[PDB]
């Protein structure tokens, strides 16, 4: 199916405590594969997935230099925004960027993106057309005008359609044993008593990959997506994910509720009851 390459970038100032902290984290689909942290003893771009051992030393040197360049340049951005927003030089501020591309099963571009935020709010973003930008406020409108006059959209478009897609294809090829695998969910249901003759039924889905999955509770073939509680799918520390969904049912009537699990690793969705 489709696959993605995403870089989560963060620059955070800290007046009086030295230079801004700069971090870059890259993912291929739901798998962390590279990282750069300016606060590390000796900041270097580092592999975060075993298959990245397939890249030679040139790659690491180049990505490390590129990261340090981006770091220094973001230091300028933080100062620039203080001017745009007329803010004090003593407060901590944050710049966030999500950059990347998505390809289909055939390796062709499905979409590209690049979005910035300042202190947790939308700042500027490249539109789906990969030709124009959308600015959230007047400060971002200044950036938009600068980028238009610099032909930034064209440069970014060349990166998204070329460089980005090409490396993603290569990463998927090199780490195919990890990235193209499917780990089937293992499910179970737990029971907890509640006051007023009510019971909490919790359906757990463990050890699966990729992260996308559907968990639902049913009663008489009807989905109770409404009175259902749950957590966002989450990483389990070993490259897999887990999730749970619960529903409150009347004591004594637990056998009428069934948990349903749908996942790429389940040729037949799972159906469980307590």
């Amino acid at each position: 199916g489709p696959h993605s390459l995403r870089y989560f970038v963060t620059a955070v100032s800290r007046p009086g405590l030295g230079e801004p902290r700069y971090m870059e984290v890259g993912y291929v689909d739901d798998t962390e594969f590279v990282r750069f942290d300016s606060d590390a003893e000796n900041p270097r771009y580092e592999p975060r997935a075993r298959w990245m051992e397939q890249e030679g030393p040139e790659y690491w040197e180049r990505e490390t230099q590129k990261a340090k360049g981006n770091e220094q340049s973001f230091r300028v951005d933080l100062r620039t925004l203080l001017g745009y927003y007329n803010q004090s030089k003593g407060g901590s501020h944050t710049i966030q960027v999500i950059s990347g591309c998505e390809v289909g099963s055939d390796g062709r571009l499905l979409r590209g993106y690049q979005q910035y935020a300042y202190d947790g709010c939308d700042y500027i973003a490249l539109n789906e057309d990969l030709k124009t930008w959308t600015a959230a406020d007047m400060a971002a409108l200044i950036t938009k005008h600068k980028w238009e006059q610099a032909g930034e959209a064209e440069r970014l478009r060349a990166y998204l359609e070329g460089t980005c897609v090409e490396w993603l294809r290569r990463y998927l090829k090199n780490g195919n044993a990890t990235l193209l695998r499917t780990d089937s969910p293992k499910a179970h249901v737990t029971h907890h008593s509640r006051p007023e003759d009510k019971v909490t039924l919790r359906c757990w889905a463990l050890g699966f990959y990729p992260a996308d999955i559907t968990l639902t509770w049913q009663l008489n073939g009807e989905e109770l997506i409404q009175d259902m509680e749950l957590v966002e799918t989450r990483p389990a520390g070993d490259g897999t994910f887990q999730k749970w969904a619960s529903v409150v049912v009347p004591l004594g009537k637990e056998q009428y509720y069934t948990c349903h699990v749908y996942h790429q690793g389940l040729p037949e969705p799972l159906t469980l009851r307590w």
Partner: peptide, 8 residues
């Protein structure tokens, strides 16, 4: 690989 970002 990451792109080289432009200034705001």
């Amino acid at each position: 690989s990451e792109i080289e970002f432009a200034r705001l």
